[PDB]
Amino acid sequence: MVSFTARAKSNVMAYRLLAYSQGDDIIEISHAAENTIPDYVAVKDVDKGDLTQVNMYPLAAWQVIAGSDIKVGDNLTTGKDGTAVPTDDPSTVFGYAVEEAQEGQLVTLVIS
């Protein structure tokens, strides 16, 4: 994979959808805003001032926290706190569920 250094700027939690921004000579990361398309997924807790890395790779699927109950095949978007939630507005869809998840459980997703 291709790794690079990035700094959290707001208490990154594991399995949350992440977004990024241009910071002080470094890419800064945080939980993705509600109702959008995320760029990266957390797989480690990284606090507000903590420095970490990002492992680049065209992953087939992500495992993220379900922000609500999810049915197999549901199109997903970002929700509160960077969780993944069911939707129906194409422009905010970043992937879809291949398995059932209850709120708070991990849900595997396939990118689109």
Binding site: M13, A14, Y15, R16, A42, V43, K44, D45, Q63, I65, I70, E99, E100, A101, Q102, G104, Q105, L106, V107, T108
Partner: protein, 50 residues
Amino acid sequence: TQVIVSPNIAAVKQGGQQQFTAYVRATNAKDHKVVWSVEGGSTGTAITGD
């Protein structure tokens, strides 16, 4: 009556995975979908639907 979770004892290194299996000792009524969850300190750290 009871739900038996697979490896009672696991040892994940961090970033690793462990498939757990539930054996729901129902009795008659075929109850189904088991809700998986996990408790811990550092945030994140979670279990898939399966």
